[PDB]
Amino acid sequence: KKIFKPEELRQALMPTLEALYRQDPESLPFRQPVDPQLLGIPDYFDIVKNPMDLSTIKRKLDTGQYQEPWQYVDDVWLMFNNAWLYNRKTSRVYKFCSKLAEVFEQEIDPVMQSLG
Numbered sequence: 001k002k003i004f005k006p007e008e009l010r011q012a013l014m015p016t017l018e019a020l021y022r023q024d025p026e027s028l029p030f031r032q033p034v035d036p037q038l039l040g041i042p043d044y045f046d047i048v049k050n051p052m053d054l055s056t057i058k059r060k061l062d063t064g065q066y067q068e069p070w071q072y073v074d075d076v077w078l079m080f081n082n083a084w085l086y087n088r089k090t091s092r093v094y095k096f097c098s099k100l101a102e103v104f105e106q107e108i109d110p111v112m113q114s115l116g
């Protein structure tokens with residue numbers, strides 16, 4: 001069984017996380033936890049049972065809260081899947097999510113291969 005030091009996951013995965021953040025305007029809806037009242041979508045938690053966003057993912061990676069790197073992959077897809085569930089398939093935020101997901105699928109593959 002691989003043993004992953006927090007510092008190894010941090011340095012290896014941070015560039016993939018930067019690749020999501022740097023997408024402008026597509027990353028903006030994902031940068032902070034969804035605030036249903038401020039956004040005027042009060043049925044958000046009626047639909048999304050487990051919220052996830054970039055700031056949470058970034059904190060876990062920065063402070064060493066992942067035991068193994070596929071939990072980071074889990075959190076990223078949970079964030080995308082939340083957005084694809086709540087938002088209609090042709091809407092702006094659905095398309096934004098799809099753009100971030102395209103970037104991620106591309107960046108994460110070689111990084112996960114090198115982590116073993």
Ligand SMILES: Cc1cc(N2CCOCC2)cc2[nH]c(-c3c(NC[C@@H](O)c4cccc(Cl)c4)cc[nH]c3=O)nc12
Nearest residue numbers: 073074077078081084098101104105108109110112113
């Ligand atoms: C690539 C892709 C495209 C799309 N759609 C494109 C068309 O438009 C609608 C959205 C939805 C996706 N959902 C998931 C997904 C996971 N993927 C792992 C993959 O990253 C992966 C798998 C093995 C090795 C590595 Cl290194 C990385 C894992 C857990 N739960 C998930 O839902 N992947 C999706």
